[PDB]
Amino acid sequence: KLLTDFRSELLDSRFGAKAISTIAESKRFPLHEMRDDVAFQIINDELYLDGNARQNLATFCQTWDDENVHKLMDLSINKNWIDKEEYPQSAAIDLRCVNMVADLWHAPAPKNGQAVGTNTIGSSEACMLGGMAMKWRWRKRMEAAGKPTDKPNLVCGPVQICWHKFARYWDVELREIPMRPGQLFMDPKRMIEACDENTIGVVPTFGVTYTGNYEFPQPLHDALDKFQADTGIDIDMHIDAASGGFLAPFVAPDIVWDFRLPRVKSISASGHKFGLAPLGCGWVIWRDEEALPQELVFNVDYLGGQIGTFAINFSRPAGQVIAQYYEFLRLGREGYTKVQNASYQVAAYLADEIAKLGPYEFICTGRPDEGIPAVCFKLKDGEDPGYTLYDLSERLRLRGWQVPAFTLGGEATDIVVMRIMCRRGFEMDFAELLLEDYKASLKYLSDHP
Amino acid sequence: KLLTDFRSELLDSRFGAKAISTIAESKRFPLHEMRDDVAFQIINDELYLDGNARQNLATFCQTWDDENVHKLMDLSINKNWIDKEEYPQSAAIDLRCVNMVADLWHAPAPKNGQAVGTNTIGSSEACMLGGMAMKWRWRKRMEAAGKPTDKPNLVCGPVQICWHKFARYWDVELREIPMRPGQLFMDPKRMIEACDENTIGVVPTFGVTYTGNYEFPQPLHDALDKFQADTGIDIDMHIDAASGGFLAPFVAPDIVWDFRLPRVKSISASGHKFGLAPLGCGWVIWRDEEALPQELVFNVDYLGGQIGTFAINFSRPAGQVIAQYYEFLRLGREGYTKVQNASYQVAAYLADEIAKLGPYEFICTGRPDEGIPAVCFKLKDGEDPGYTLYDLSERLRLRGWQVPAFTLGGEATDIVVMRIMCRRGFEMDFAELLLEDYKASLKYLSDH
Amino acid sequence: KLLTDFRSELLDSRFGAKAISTIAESKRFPLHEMRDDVAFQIINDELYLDGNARQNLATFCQTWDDENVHKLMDLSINKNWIDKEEYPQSAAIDLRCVNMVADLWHAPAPKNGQAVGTNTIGSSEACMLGGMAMKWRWRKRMEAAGKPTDKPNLVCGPVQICWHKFARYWDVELREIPMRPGQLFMDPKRMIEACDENTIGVVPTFGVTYTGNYEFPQPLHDALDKFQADTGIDIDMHIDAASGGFLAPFVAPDIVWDFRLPRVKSISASGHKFGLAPLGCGWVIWRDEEALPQELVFNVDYLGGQIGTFAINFSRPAGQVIAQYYEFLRLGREGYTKVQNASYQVAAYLADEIAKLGPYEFICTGRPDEGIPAVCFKLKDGEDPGYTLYDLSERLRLRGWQVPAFTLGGEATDIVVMRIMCRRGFEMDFAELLLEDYKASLKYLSDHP
Amino acid sequence: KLLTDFRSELLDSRFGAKAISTIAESKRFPLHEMRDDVAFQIINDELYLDGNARQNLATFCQTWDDENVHKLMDLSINKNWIDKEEYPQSAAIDLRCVNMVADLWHAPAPKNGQAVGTNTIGSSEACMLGGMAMKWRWRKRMEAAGKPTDKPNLVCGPVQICWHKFARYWDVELREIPMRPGQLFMDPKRMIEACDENTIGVVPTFGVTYTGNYEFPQPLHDALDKFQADTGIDIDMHIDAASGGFLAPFVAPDIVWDFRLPRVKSISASGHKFGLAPLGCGWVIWRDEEALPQELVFNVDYLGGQIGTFAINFSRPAGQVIAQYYEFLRLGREGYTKVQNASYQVAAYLADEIAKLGPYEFICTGRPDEGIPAVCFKLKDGEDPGYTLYDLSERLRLRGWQVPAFTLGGEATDIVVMRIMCRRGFEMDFAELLLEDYKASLKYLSDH
Ligand SMILES: *Cc1c(COP(=O)(O)O)cnc(C)c1O
Ligand SMILES: *Cc1c(COP(=O)(O)O)cnc(C)c1O
Ligand SMILES: *Cc1c(COP(=O)(O)O)cnc(C)c1O
Ligand SMILES: *Cc1c(COP(=O)(O)O)cnc(C)c1O
Ligand SMILES: O=C(O)CCCC(=O)O
Ligand SMILES: O=C(O)CCCC(=O)O
Ligand SMILES: O=C(O)CCCC(=O)O
Ligand SMILES: O=C(O)CCCC(=O)O
């Protein structure tokens, strides 16, 4: 029988083959090789249950990339970002990106022509690096003054989860100012009340994930200036600009949020959100050499010279930084402006149209001077139109859309909001389709209450 | 006037276009859009200066991937690993890989059908997760007996730099036993001298980068058993198996290095090394739930339920894990054995042939019971054949090969070695071409 | 065991397969078939040792072709250039190319609307054809005068090797005017001194390979006019325009080098150098029907008529002539001008920048009125900066560049030059990279003398 | 005004664009650039008028190539065959092909491990190299005995035109023994009558184009042996094996035609015929170093060493040799035999079936011991079935087939034959369709 078994293995179509007759292994390392077309097909087919990323309106990350980015990423699948000597031109492109991001954020013109900063996998790694640099600068300052350094704290607003991870992993007490009704962000008064000489720094979120709105660093900065005048305590900022960092420079250049403020010692952002890079690209820039403690830096060989690295990851692909550079050259300020405008235009259209459909109060309407291209809203207080925003999120899912409804944190856990993200590749015509599905979902719900 | 400029912008070939007449911007964010084919061309051409990855014999990482992996990675370009609810089947495939890797390393069969471990970007993140968990278990041990926890140290041999970064970033004193002539590894005697009540753990390197040889955990394990009997101090191990974790299980199954040893609480390896995954894949497995302190774990929603995450990175692509899972199913144990065997057959051929060409002493000759598929050698003490291994490396570079020569560390900084890595995609016929260039280089050097 | 051997042959990945475990056959015809993916992979991988053609700066031939040329060549892989009846439209396209090249070189407007000339594989074949036509025209002239025809000679400057091959294969004495310091080309005085009644013709090289400079035919032509007035000996020219033939018409149309000169009876050029065709395309044009002896022509069938062929090769692909025609239509004079300008611009930039780095004397600086887009230079006489140009060529190779250093011939064998060719696909940004590597190579050499 | 013209140039579909409204330039170098997609489209469409190469049954050359060959040729588009130092591994692969072809033809095992021979663009260049070498060896023979060298001749049968070009271009008198009814080849008796002390060599055609039959060198060889005994004149042979050199070694190994015969000093063949290479590949091999006069050889630098070149062409692509080498490794002797066998099985089927349809006399029926896989036939003497083979050829053309009818040369210019070539890619099912059209054509002709 084994002779014809081989014949069938050779000649059978992939759906007729004996190999595709079993459920895929999920518990132990498999013993045998299998026909490669069958292994590929089974996995391809499972991934349909992820759903359609273009209809995922919960994520802030890129769900479309141009044809040149597909090619560049494929060309770069084996290029190792950390091996600066072995892939020297990829390393040179990375360093150009550092200069360009620093220039966008108005970093002081660097002495030797190279800005201080690095690429990362994402804002998470970039925030941990900014956070370690803060803890170290604070330690040195406390040692100069003969104070103990065993109780650091960090003051912040409604941050993304990575900051809670930072605090846990590096033994820093987190002082989060809670959201409450009427102020869903860190205000200067509440911030100052949480500051003391053990505060390693303050972290405004320039593009809050929950609501889509900017926390503005300028009023916070004014308070810290007054704090130093009144107490002598000198506190710095790190801006978590995961979203806002590739938005405001293009569509709202007069907001003063970046290195134009002297206490901003570092800024981080996700290239793979509004920076237009594919997943796996983040940036952190320091204001100058003094803002990055040298004891955190590890030197590696690079072309008869040496380059300073600051990284948690080691080997990883260089495609994403190469793709980021392509977007910088191909679009420039002009192109980024047009692409971001298109997102804000779609958000404004949706905020405008959804307003006429129900009893809603908007927290974010996609104004460029207020936040990111997002639409965020709640049911108006003490109305019951016969559905919750959860019921509406569920109806929209029947058509493949992921549109999240969730409660806020802090003292706002009573409040349920729905948030729609407007990214590149969510064009007006495609938005109109979501809107048709929103109208049809409401029709259904008003008929089955 | 500007109309003839627009006409040319539309019609010019990309090498004749005005946009390709300038040097690419390097200092400031560019102001204007440019023709996409021109932007692509300039960058594509710059990247030729990286050289040829297939001829890079310095790296341990994958420099070839099969056609299915190219397809899967392109299909997964925008699938987010951290968003378990948004990409639920990518998440499920990830959990299968954790089970399979735990099985490979003889993790005790899991209670609830799911091994304790996680995917990472690479061994570096995986080692920091393993390190933090070691430091936390030690803190708890010390607190149960009323003792101070302010002076943690970690004992190790000739580790990769990520362990130096771990020590610096988490304020742990590193006790690195230095390499010395005649012992280029952590021996049990020196390991014990460095251990005390403040030792959070011992990290053997199951595949040392500098030499390619295994540090064998078993004799170290016997020593820590006597240490506990003698002193009452109970020390765990984490195995840094960045290369070895996907070699020995297939080609040297009788080496006892993994969870079969009681003191081994966690193990890490690089999928994108000998795991055959593309760049951006690592693993760490814990022996059971008790080995991972729950205060390090952050729970997320997953399909009505909740799953525990332990990660430093947040958003990052899921293609590498999907690729890994494809290699597991497509190759299985049988195919992994055949692929690694081809690498060892190539290392053994080169060790053999290079030995005829000069006065060389081999530190690693590509034997599977002793290490990874690498060739590592020095010039014999005493002899001077008229060249150093640096001159040899430079001659080989003229033909595009990257073959590193470097000094060893610690107390062996007088020893210069050359190391050749034999990876997937460095087949016998291709290695013969390297050997012909080695022969040509020596001839040239003897004539000068 | 043979049963599982087959299983493995079926199922094994290409790098795990038993077939890829041996060194490739190099001595005898192999006996067995092998899996086709393994045969392809082994050969693909060997070819990496060729290096990167885009970084080969020694060659004058095309190392990049546009996407339409890749498609047209693939479509034409089986189309046979010599089979005029069997591939009749490919044959018609070839004939159009002849008219267009003749028109570019100012050939007299042809009587019946078809110029006299042919496509070849390259300038080598085209030069042998021009050379045979010269030998035959001379024989006839010598017979009319009752002189013997057993000692033909050919007068020339610093020619490419094909002319030495011509002389050896057709029993013609080669009278090469040697290069000497101060005149690296054939001058009118030395040329006339080598001319006699046995001279079948004179061959100026319009784009000398060694230096990159034009030998100008006009001053030579004036001398031959005077020679005929003084002695009655009437000598013709063939221009070897391998390079210059697709440069000067676009960027220096006022140089009189072509059929505007009455003694120019034929001209050859390589399409696959500056003609922008892929390797395998050359052209030779005769001034009129009388310049091509009929006894050298073989007629073949073509559409109820007959076409005259003159060719050494027989079967060969027609893709290259098809690609040449596409470039003619797609670029025209306008497009060729822009592409050649881009090469001259890169050469000027490199001549300018290299000048500041060392004690150099330039022989070619990429001026369009003087020669081709090449940079050619030597160490200044009696300086020793502690390296030779050989040492510099070697350092540049570490980064994958092929930049040749070599001695000149004739009485200039003391002189070592370095030559950089600037072709299509060697854009300014890419040139800047070579320049960085040149600066870094000099740093190294001044530190290890 | 001109702004609406630019807008249209950007937006128009390629068949709606203004640029495609004119007839392509044919007389003068064009003045302006045009949209690249339009330039491509016009030319692509013109090339439909070539007809379908797969249906061209007149040619001996490859009209199909496998996917790997398409890839290799595209990858080699810019690799220069003549630049041995600049493309050194392309050069090395070329030298392997020379060894393998010499081995196939039973060349005496080479002294220094490298056969004497070269790749060429085709048999035509290869025959001129072989011819020049014959003329030079003869010159030297004559000079050693004080004799004049001004009247060389060459003796041959029904050769392809390249031999006529060789004679004209190198001033050699051609002594072509003409075909005649009952003997359509050079027989030993007429060959000897044409030989004298001025004969540079004899060129048998191992695969005659006009008929498809082999001229067998062995009986000619026996005759030249008697000639030397009788007269003392020593004459060499060059075999023009343009088709036969890649057939007989695989399917008729017992035919003695190659270097097994002492007088055979050189052999040429077309790779791009039955060698399975794409257009642009030929070979010529010499029996040893002595057979190739060194004054014809031009040396070039190759990796510290130097190699001898003999070539008329200079720059030309290296893809065809790389492709050839791929077919050698991928097929070997086993696969070449299976491919050629399929061609002979198709010729034998057609000879068989066409014989039932009319009053025909076969000159070639696709037997491997007699010739190449071709069908060649005439109308039987006497009979007139109401059509000529020209009418038949024209009816077949209505369905896209190119099947030539033509008169034979020499003293047989009264004989009209039809010839069908059975190449790779003319499979049994496709040949059945040709036979159905042949049947339909005859029916039509009988009704008119
Ligand atoms: C996304 C985000 C992060 C996390 O960054 P990744 O790019 O996902 O690593 C941190 N903070 C904010 C405000 C974010 O939006
Ligand atoms: C490669 C390696 C590392 C680093 O892992 P990455 O996968 O590069 O992050 C750590 N330790 C050892 C022994 C290694 O070989
Ligand atoms: C290139 C060249 C040749 C040879 O032509 P191919 O195109 O290489 O056959 C002859 N003469 C000169 C001046 C050349 O530049
Ligand atoms: C085809 C052929 C030739 C010509 O060879 P090409 O490969 O077309 O140059 C010469 N002689 C014979 C017998 C042929 O068949
Ligand atoms: O943008 C992401 O993918 C992660 C954060 C927001 C979310 O998806 O819920
Ligand atoms: O494997 C790698 O790529 C990183 C470390 C080893 C090296 O390249 O030297
Ligand atoms: O252009 C070529 O390829 C041949 C001549 C110049 C050279 O390469 O050396
Ligand atoms: O094989 C060829 O293509 C050329 C000669 C034979 C013919 O086509 O008639």
Side-chain angles (χ1 to χ4, degrees), chain C residues 268-428:
Chain C
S268 51
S270 309
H272 57 226
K273 289 173 183 177
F274 296 90
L276 301 189
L279 278 171
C281 181
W283 299 103
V284 55
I285 302 293
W286 279 268
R287 119 175 257 111
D288 50 39
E289 187 154 29
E290 258 104 279
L292 180 52
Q294 273 290 313
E295 33 271 282
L296 297 172
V297 175
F298 282 78
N299 293 322
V300 309
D301 300 323
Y302 184 65
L303 300 172
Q306 274 195 331
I307 181 188
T309 65
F310 190 25
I312 282 158
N313 302 299
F314 200 82
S315 296
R316 73 182 168 90
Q320 289 92 343
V321 48
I322 287 156
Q324 183 79 99
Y325 188 55
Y326 157 83
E327 296 293 358
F328 289 178
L329 292 187
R330 185 269 180 274
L331 292 174
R333 279 189 195 270
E334 174 190 4
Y336 271 83
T337 299
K338 290 155 155 176
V339 168
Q340 314 299 21
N341 277 167
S343 280
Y344 279 109
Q345 277 11 277
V346 168
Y349 162 78
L350 287 176
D352 227 300
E353 297 286 342
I354 288 161
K356 308 140 128 106
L357 301 180
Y360 310 130
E361 181 181 330
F362 290 75
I363 286 148
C364 190
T365 62
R367 282 129 71 66
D369 50 301
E370 258 151 52
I372 78 185
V375 185
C376 187
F377 66 91
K378 48 184 233 91
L379 291 183
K380 224 171 243 148
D381 274 275
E383 311 271 76
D384 165 29
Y387 56 87
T388 73
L389 292 180
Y390 298 113
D391 303 322
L392 187 52
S393 178
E394 194 259 16
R395 296 307 300 177
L396 289 168
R397 201 40 183 285
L398 294 167
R399 292 275 279 162
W401 301 107
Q402 292 186 70
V403 180
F406 52 91
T407 59
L408 297 167
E411 282 153 49
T413 61
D414 243 353
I415 298 168
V416 175
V417 308
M418 170 172 264
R419 178 197 73 209
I420 304 154
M421 196 54 45
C422 299
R423 299 181 311 279
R424 178 180 59 170
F426 190 47
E427 64 267 44
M428 195 70 54

Side-chain angles (χ1 to χ4, degrees), chain C residues 236-290:
Chain C
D236 309 318
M237 311 175 102
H238 171 95
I239 314 305
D240 186 351
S243 290
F246 291 105
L247 287 165
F250 306 109
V251 293
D254 297 314
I255 305 188
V256 184
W257 69 271
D258 49 25
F259 294 119
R260 289 170 279 179
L261 302 165
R263 293 174 187 284
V264 173
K265 299 309 180 68
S266 52
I267 299 177
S268 51
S270 309
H272 57 226
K273 289 173 183 177
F274 296 90
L276 301 189
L279 278 171
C281 181
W283 299 103
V284 55
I285 302 293
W286 279 268
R287 119 175 257 111
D288 50 39
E289 187 154 29
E290 258 104 279

Side-chain angles (χ1 to χ4, degrees), chain C residues 90-110:
Chain C
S90 286
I93 288 157
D94 173 76
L95 296 173
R96 304 184 182 174
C97 288
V98 180
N99 283 337
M100 295 181 166
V101 170
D103 175 57
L104 191 78
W105 295 344
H106 291 106

Side-chain angles (χ1 to χ4, degrees), chain B residues 172-183:
Chain B
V172 170
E173 158 186 309
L174 192 68
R175 295 185 179 187
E176 178 175 346
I177 289 116
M179 293 175 161
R180 61 146 150 243
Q183 90 193 153

Side-chain angles (χ1 to χ4, degrees), chain A residues 24-34 36 39-40 43-44 46-47 49-50 53 56 58-59 61-65 68 70-75 77-80 83 86-90 93 96 99-100 103-104 121 124-125 128 132 135-136 139 160-161 164-165 168-171 250 272 278-280 295-296 298 309-317 320 322 325-326 328-336 338 402, chain B residues 24-34 36 39-40 43-44 46-47 49-50 53 56 58-59 61-65 68 70-75 77-80 83 86-90 93 96 99-100 103-104 113 121 124-125 132 135-136 139 160-161 164-165 168-171 250 272 278-280 295-296 298 309-317 320 322 325-326 328-336 338 402:
Chain A
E25 182 65 52
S26 79
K27 271 141 121 55
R28 325 220 281 130
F29 210 94
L31 174 69
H32 292 109
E33 308 178 316
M34 99 182 234
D36 76 296
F40 169 83
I43 292 170
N44 180 81
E46 292 200 357
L47 292 172
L49 276 290
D50 275 350
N56 175 353
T59 188
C61 301
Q62 283 312 302
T63 45
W64 184 83
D65 321 83
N68 291 324
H70 282 266
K71 293 171 184 214
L72 288 169
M73 280 294 288
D74 188 64
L75 256 8
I77 191 172
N78 301 318
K79 282 175 186 297
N80 194 346
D83 284 345
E86 295 165 38
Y87 306 86
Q89 194 60 27
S90 286
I93 288 157
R96 304 184 182 174
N99 283 337
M100 295 181 166
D103 175 57
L104 191 78
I121 275 285
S124 191
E125 179 180 29
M128 323 287 184
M132 277 188 277
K135 189 180 167 193
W136 259 255
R139 261 173 186 178
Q160 205 264 350
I161 193 64
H164 292 233
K165 310 217 183 170
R168 190 74 57 64
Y169 301 160
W170 282 271
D171 301 303
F250 306 109
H272 57 226
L279 278 171
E295 33 271 282
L296 297 172
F298 282 78
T309 65
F310 190 25
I312 282 158
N313 302 299
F314 200 82
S315 296
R316 73 182 168 90
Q320 289 92 343
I322 287 156
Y325 188 55
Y326 157 83
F328 289 178
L329 292 187
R330 185 269 180 274
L331 292 174
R333 279 189 195 270
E334 174 190 4
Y336 271 83
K338 290 155 155 176
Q402 292 186 70
Chain B
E25 186 63 66
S26 78
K27 304 110 152 269
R28 292 211 261 278
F29 206 93
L31 178 53
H32 289 122
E33 308 183 306
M34 72 177 298
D36 75 292
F40 172 80
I43 291 166
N44 173 84
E46 290 196 1
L47 290 171
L49 269 297
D50 275 346
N56 180 0
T59 185
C61 298
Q62 295 299 307
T63 46
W64 187 85
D65 319 83
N68 292 320
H70 281 266
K71 293 216 212 100
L72 285 165
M73 282 288 296
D74 187 66
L75 285 167
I77 189 166
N78 310 311
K79 289 180 186 291
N80 196 347
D83 293 332
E86 298 173 37
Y87 301 96
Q89 190 65 25
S90 289
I93 291 178
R96 293 175 192 184
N99 289 335
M100 299 165 72
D103 177 58
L104 191 61
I121 275 288
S124 182
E125 174 175 30
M132 267 187 286
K135 185 190 186 197
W136 261 249
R139 273 202 193 138
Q160 206 261 354
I161 193 81
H164 289 254
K165 307 193 178 184
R168 183 73 44 77
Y169 297 162
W170 276 275
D171 301 302
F250 305 112
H272 55 225
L279 277 177
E295 41 284 291
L296 293 165
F298 281 79
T309 64
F310 190 19
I312 280 152
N313 297 299
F314 200 84
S315 293
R316 57 180 180 97
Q320 294 96 332
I322 289 163
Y325 187 59
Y326 158 87
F328 284 179
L329 284 187
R330 182 258 177 285
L331 289 177
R333 209 171 277 275
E334 170 196 357
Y336 268 85
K338 291 168 158 167
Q402 298 187 67

